């Protein structure tokens, strides 16, 4: 499955899981520490 | 010519009847490149030897609470055991993945590097840490009867056991999560309601597994 | 050639035959490497002897002394020198000759000579079997000895875990079990006393309480693997 | 190494201690003297710490001893781990200024000689005096050898001042130990366990202290 | 070797003879920061000066606190002595720092100008005569003369023990600054009384239970 | 005490915004009954903002007439009167995760310019490369300051330029 991981290393695909991966971790950030209008912690 | 496990079917290119327990499974090729296959070996080795220890702790704890003493299921043995003992549960689980990260990155860098963890950095210990083969480390702390060592035979009808065994165990214990969350009860129990009559009680009759009736 | 375990087998290439006791049973190979099978002949050695002198022990204190059953005889002693002043002496006396019997058995060559009396020592001896002065009066050849040695001390091993599987069972000590058992045959075997079948299990129950006092404490005494008990 | 006496018998050991050092039996299990620079440093240290420790343990049984016997000092009865609290002539702060002062004298003199051996054996005033050539660090002679010691029995001694030097060390850690434990003199606990042997152990006594 | 992770593959930069001649090179660099020797020799001369800094003040705040809680002395927490010292003091902390400031200044100036051309501050006629004793030494962030007064550094024997001495304490006490630091905002309590509740109860006082370190545990 | 503003915590106009939503959220919740989905989602809801103002007066933020929190841009009033964690400190938050992917992206376009089809490895992402970057980067500002220092970071005049310079 070289093929099959190279193609999952393509510009869109490793872009969907970056943003997938960035996304979550901002939404799971906001969801634990909800309204962070200012940085006081 | 090998045995396969699904007969008639010829066995992938990268499963190559040499490692323990190899039957040619592979639907998916997820083990298609080599150094992909080595960690994944390590990984079943692992994942079925912790597997053997989790059926058979479940399985010993199960009996005893079976026969009436004290012990409680496997579902609820970690409250019991940090509420008899005033353990701090996150102090024990800092503990156990402070010397669960030391052991397991020995071993990521035995995998990395499989010549490293034989120079004598840990303690002095050199040939204790060497690894004979990947997922196999063997030596006097790994393998202080020396199995490995002597007869080559019988230790690779052990490799073929252990691997074997460790299948079971990771199904067994697969088995035991399933049958806590259908039946809510040990796994001993559900032995026991099934040995009772085998007909009428299984999962067929749990309204959980078989939701059509 | 050599008297088998099996009579009809084929003993393990590494069992040659030279060894006292080597009947050809290593079904597991513990004993394949050479390294291992100088240890575990240590180990058989002292584990025969111990349980020996053990089983040989239990059995006098029981005709001599059967006020005492030799399970609880650990809490029935009441000496004058105290539990830890016993326990100090034989620890440290015991981490003596092990240590040195350990040192004989890594560097062989190591430890024949008197620490305090230069002019005394052990002549070259084999590994297991010292000999020099703890073995004056050796009645006959060495060999079949040392046969007769390990054969009654594989007997004596299993000799001593009856004794303890007997006496968590029964609760009584070994010739009370075999009066036991001499009075009703049928009915006081493991057999007769427990029973699985698919659908039940009649396990056995201890005869020894699960803990005892010993002094303002409380010694946890469990059944040793009970719940495998059939 | 050679057939020398060892710490354990049989025992491989290290090598680089190969008994020019008196009191060498092998024992380096964390190879802190593997280095012959800092081996030459911990033969004058263990020989320090041993001869203090010798005068130490001296200096708290033959009082403790003096004491229990009956005899009659101002400072007779007062525990070692008490006798600085005592009052004397001077303050303490006096005496240590004093003992400093002095040592800083002999100590430098001492390491005068174990940088550079031969140096330190003239006094500053009467050159007159001296110490014999040929000494080595930590044996000087001469007036620090007055009642004729070292013409042979030399090797003897000194294993024999290493062997009495590394027990009083481990008495000085005793005494340490027990009165922090105990909190009794030395002897007083000698008598103690002489009293009864077998309820006076260490472990009896932790155990029974917890 | 001596590595930070015996099976690691050490960066090339850390294997050089220019680094392998380092104090304490046991091949960490995970982030590469030392990959330029301009950069490694800057960042060896940094890890000296944080080094020494944090073991005087972790020193000055672990001894003292000792003595405190032994009674030799009555020194407050190192995170009140601020305070302290300025309310028994002679001066406002602004003057005291603006002193300090350029007292400071200068002499990590002229060991700025010293890195920046090594040797340079010899220039004869810049001090009065001293410049002569600020040549440093063969090796950078290891100056001697008057900073070596009892000569240890004039053996070439004990030399390379001692830089991996001095520099393997520094980075243990960077670290038992950093704990402090921590242990402060953590607990509340000072370092030594940290140690004691520890050590009375281990298995129940660690960083596992208070309630910041792990807020999910 | 700033430009007029006054603290959130002194406010009325920020308490009657607090009451205001309350309200709004409660009349919501009138409609369901004591543990409905919709009366825990509510409740819920309320608590988040309750909280939340809590957590804004609790920060030193100022309101003005509206009772809105506003935010303090300037270095020097933000640092005199503790508004720091309001523009100035995620300022700096924000520079270092922005150069952190800036000096990432640059690594592995370096990276990846010494192979012989690097257009194809950008279209294709070498993600053990990109991984091993993208957590050695996390030293970004030192690294680049030392590349800045060694005159490497920048190019010289072999770019490229129209005919009139
Ligand atoms: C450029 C304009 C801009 C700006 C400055 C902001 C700023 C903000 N918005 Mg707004 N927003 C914008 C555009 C903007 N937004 C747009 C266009 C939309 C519509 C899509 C929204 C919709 C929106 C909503 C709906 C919400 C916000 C919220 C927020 C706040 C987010 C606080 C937060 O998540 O803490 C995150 C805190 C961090 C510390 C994260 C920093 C990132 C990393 C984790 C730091 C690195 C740590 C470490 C080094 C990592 C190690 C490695 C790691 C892999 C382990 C903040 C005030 C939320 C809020 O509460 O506002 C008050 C909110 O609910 N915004
Ligand atoms: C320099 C070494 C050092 C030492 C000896 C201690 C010792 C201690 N710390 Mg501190 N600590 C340190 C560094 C150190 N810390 C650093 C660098 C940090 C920041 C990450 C902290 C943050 C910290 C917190 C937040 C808390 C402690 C607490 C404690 C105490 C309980 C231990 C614990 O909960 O885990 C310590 C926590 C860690 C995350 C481990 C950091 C240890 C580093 C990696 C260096 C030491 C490792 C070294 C290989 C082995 C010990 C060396 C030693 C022999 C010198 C104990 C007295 C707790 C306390 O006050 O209990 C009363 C507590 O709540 N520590
Ligand atoms: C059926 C189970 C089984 C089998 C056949 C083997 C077989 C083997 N293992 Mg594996 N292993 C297992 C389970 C098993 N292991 C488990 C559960 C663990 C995790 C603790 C390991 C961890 C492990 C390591 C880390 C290493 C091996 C090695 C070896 C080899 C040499 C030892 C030998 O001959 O074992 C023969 C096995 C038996 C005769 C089975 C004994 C039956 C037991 C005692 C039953 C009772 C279990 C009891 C209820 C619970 C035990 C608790 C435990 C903590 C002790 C051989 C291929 C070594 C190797 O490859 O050397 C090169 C090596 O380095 N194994
Ligand atoms: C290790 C094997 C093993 C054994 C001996 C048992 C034994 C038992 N199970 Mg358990 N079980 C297992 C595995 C096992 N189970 C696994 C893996 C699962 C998850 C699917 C379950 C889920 C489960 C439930 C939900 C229930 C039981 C129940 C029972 C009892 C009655 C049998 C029954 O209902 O049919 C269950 C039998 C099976 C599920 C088949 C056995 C496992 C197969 C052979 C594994 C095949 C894996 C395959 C080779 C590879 C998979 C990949 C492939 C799809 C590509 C009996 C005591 C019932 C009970 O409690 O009795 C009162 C009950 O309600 N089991
Ligand atoms: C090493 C060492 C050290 C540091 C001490 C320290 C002390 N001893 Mg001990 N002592 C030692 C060795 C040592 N002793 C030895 C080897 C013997 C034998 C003794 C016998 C001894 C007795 C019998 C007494 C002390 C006392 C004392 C205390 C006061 C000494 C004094 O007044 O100066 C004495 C200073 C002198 C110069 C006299 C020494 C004369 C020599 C020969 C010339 C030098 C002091 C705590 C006294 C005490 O406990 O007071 C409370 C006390 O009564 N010591
Ligand atoms: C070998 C060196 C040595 C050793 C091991 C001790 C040990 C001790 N001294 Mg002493 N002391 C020494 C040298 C030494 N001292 C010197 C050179 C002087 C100056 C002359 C003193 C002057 C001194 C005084 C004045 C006191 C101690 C006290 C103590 C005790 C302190 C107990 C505690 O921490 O609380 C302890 C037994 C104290 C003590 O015994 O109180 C019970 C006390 O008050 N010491
Ligand atoms: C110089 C050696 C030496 C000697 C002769 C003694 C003697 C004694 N100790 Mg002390 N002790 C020593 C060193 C020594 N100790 C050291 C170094 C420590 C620090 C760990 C202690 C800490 C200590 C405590 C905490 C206690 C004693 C107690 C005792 C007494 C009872 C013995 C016991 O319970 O086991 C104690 C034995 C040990 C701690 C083992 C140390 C063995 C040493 C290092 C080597 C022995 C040399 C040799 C092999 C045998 C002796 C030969 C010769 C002296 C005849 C006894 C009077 C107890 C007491 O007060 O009784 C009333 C008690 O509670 N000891
Ligand atoms: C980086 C090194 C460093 C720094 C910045 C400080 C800073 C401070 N120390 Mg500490 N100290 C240090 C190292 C350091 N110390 C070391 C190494 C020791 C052990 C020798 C001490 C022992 C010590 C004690 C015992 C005391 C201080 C005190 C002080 C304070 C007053 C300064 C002073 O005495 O006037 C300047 C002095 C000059 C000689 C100039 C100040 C907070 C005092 C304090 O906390 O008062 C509240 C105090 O009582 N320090
Ligand atoms: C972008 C340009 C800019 C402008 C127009 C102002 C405007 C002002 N500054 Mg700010 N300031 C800025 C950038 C700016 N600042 C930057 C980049 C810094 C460095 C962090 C500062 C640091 C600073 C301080 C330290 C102080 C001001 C102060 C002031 C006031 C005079 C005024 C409101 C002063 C102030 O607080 O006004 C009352 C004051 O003390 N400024
Ligand atoms: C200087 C220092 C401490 C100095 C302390 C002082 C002066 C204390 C002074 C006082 O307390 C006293 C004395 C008394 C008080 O009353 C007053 C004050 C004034 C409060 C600490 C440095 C402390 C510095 C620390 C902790 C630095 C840690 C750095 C680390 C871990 C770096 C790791 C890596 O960079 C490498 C090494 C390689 C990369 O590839 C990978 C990564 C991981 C990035």
Redesign the interface.
Not at chain 4, 8 to 11: E, K, L, Q, S, Y
């Given at each position: 499955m070289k093929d099959f991981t190279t193609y999952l290393s393509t510009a869109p695909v490793i872009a969907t899981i970056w943003f997938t991966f960035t996304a979550g971790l901002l939404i799971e950030i906001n969801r634990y520490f909800p309204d962070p209008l200012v940085f006081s912690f | 010519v090998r045995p396969v496990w699904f007969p008639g079917n010829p066995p992938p290119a990268h499963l190559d009847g040499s490692l323990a327990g190899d039957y040619g499974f592979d639907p998916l090729f997820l083990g298609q490149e080599p150094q992909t296959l080595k960690w994944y070996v390590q990984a079943e080795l692992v994942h079925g030897r912790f597997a053997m220890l989790g059926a058979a702790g479940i399985i010993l704890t199960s009996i005893g609470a079976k026969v009436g003493l004290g012990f409680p299921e496997w579902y609820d043995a970690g409250k019991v055991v940090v509420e008899k003992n005033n353990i701090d549960f996150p102090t024990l689980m800092v503990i156990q993945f402070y010397l669960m990260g030391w052991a397991e990155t020995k071993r990521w860098y035995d995998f990395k590097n499989p010549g490293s963890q034989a120079d004598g950095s840990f303690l002095g210990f050199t040939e204790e840490f060497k690894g004979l083969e990947n997922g196999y480390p063997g030596g006097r702390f790994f393998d202080p009867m020396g199995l490995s060592r002597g007869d080559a035979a019988k230790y690779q009808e052990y490799k073929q056991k252990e691997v074997k065994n460790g299948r079971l165990a990771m199904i067994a214990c697969l088995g035991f999560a399933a049958q806590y969350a259908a039946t809510g009860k040990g796994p001993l129990d559900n032995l026991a309601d099934h040995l009772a009559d085998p007909n009428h009680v299984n999962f067929a009759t749990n309204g959980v597994s078989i939701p059509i009736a | 050639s050599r008297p088998l375990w099996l009579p009809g087998s084929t003993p393990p290439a590494h069992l040659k035959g030279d060894l006292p006791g080597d009947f050809g049973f290593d079904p597991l190979g513990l004993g394949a490497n050479a390294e291992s099978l100088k240890w575990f002949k240590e180990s058989e050695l002292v584990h025969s002897r111990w349980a020996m002198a053990a089983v040989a022990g239990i059995l006098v204190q029981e005709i001599v002394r059967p006020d005492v059953f030799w399970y609880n005889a650990g809490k029935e002693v009441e000496s004058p020198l105290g539990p830890l002043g016993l326990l100090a002496v034989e620890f440290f006396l015991m981490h003596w000759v092990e240590v040195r019997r350990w040192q004989d058995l890594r560097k062989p060559g190591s430890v024949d000579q008197d620490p305090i009396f230069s002019q005394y020592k052990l002549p070259p001896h084999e590994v297991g079997y010292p000999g020099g002065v703890f073995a004056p009066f050796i009645p006959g050849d060495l060999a079949e000895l040392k046969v007769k040695e390990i054969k009654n001390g594989r007997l004596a091993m299993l000799a001593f875990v009856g004794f303890v599987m007997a006496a968590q069972v029964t609760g009584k000590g070994p010739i009370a079990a075999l009066q036991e058992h001499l009075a009703d045959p049928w009915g006081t075997t493991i057999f007769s006393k427990a029973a699985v079948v698919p659908g039940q299990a009649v396990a056995p129950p201890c005869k020894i309480p699960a803990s005892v006092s010993y002094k303002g404490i409380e010694i946890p005494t469990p059944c040793f693997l009970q719940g495998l008990w059939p | 190494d050679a057939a020398l006496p060892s710490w354990?018998?049989?025992?491989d050991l290290p090598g680089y201690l190969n008994g020019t050092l008196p009191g060498d039996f092998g024992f380096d299990p964390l190879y802190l003297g593997q280095?012959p620079?800092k081996l030459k440093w911990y033969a004058q240290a263990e020989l320090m710490n041993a001869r203090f420790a010798m005068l130490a343990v001296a200096g708290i049984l033959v009082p403790e001893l003096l004491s229990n016997i009956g005899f009659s000092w101002p400072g007779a009865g007062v525990a070692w781990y008490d006798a600085g609290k005592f009052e004397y002539f001077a303050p303490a702060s006096s005496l240590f200024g004093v003992q400093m002062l002095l040592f800083a004298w002999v100590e430098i003199r001492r390491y005068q000689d174990f940088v550079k051996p031969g140096s330190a054996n003239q006094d500053p005033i009467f050159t007159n005096n001296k110490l014999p050539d040929g000494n080595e660090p930590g044996y000087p002679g001469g007036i620090f050898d007055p009642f004729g010691w070292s013409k042979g029995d030399i090797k003897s001694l000194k294993l024999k001042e290493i062997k009495n030097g590394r027990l009083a060390m481990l008495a000085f850690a005793g005494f340490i130990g027990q009165a922090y434990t105990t909190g009794t003199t030395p002897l007083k606990n000698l008598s103690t366990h002489l009293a009864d042997?077998?309820?006076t152990?260490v472990?009896?006594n932790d155990?029974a202290r917890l | 070797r001596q590595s930070w992770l015996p099976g690691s593959q050490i960066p090339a930069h850390l294997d050089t003879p220019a680094a392998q001649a380092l104090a304490g090179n046991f091949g960490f660099d995970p982030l590469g920061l030392g990959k330029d020797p301009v950069a490694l020799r800057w960042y060896q001369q940094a890890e000296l000066i944080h080094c020494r800094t944090a073991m005087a003040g972790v020193a000055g705040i672990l001894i003292p606190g000792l003595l405190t809680k032994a009674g030799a002395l009555n020194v407050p927490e190192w995170y009140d002595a601020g305070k302290v010292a300025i309310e028994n003091s002679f001066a406002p902390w602004g003057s005291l720092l603006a002193v300090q400031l350029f007292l400071c200044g200068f002499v990590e100036a002229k060991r700025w100008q010293d890195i920046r051309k090594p040797g340079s501050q010899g220039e004869p006629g810049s001090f009065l005569g001293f410049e002569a004793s600020l040549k440093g030494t063969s090796e950078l962030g290891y100056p001697g003369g008057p900073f070596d007064p009892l000569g240890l550094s004039k053996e070439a024997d004990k030399w390379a023990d001692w830089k991996l001495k001095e520099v393997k304490n520094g980075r243990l006490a960077m670290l038992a600054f950093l704990g402090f630091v921590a242990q402060k905002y953590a607990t509340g309590a000072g370092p030594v009384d940290n140690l004691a509740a520890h050590l009375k109860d281990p298995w129940h006082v660690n960083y596992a239970t208070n309630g910041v370190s792990l807020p999910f545990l | 005490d700033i430009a007029g503003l006054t603290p959130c915590s002194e406010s009325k106009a920020y308490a009657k915004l607090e009451k205001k939503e309350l309200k709004t959220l409660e009349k919501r919740l009138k409609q369901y009954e004591a543990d409905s989905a919709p009366a825990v989602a509510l409740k819920a809801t309320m608590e988040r903002t309750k909280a939340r103002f809590a957590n804004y007066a609790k920060a030193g933020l100022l309101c003005g007439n509206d009772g809105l929190p506003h935010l303090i841009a300037d270095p020097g009033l933000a640092l005199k009167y503790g508004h720091a964690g309001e523009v100035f400190i995620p300022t700096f938050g924000f520079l270092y995760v922005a150069g952190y992917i800036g000096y990432v992206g640059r690594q592995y376009l370096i990276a990846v310019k010494g192979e012989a089809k690097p257009t194809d490895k950008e279209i294709i992402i070498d993600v053990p490369l990109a991984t091993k970057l993208a957590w050695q980067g996390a030293g970004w500002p030192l690294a680049a300051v030392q590349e800045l220092q060694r005159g490497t970071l920048l190019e010289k005049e072999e770019n490229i330029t129209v005919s009139p310079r």
């Open positions: - | - | - | 354990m018998p049989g025992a280095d620079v042997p077998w309820s152990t472990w009896q155990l | - | -």
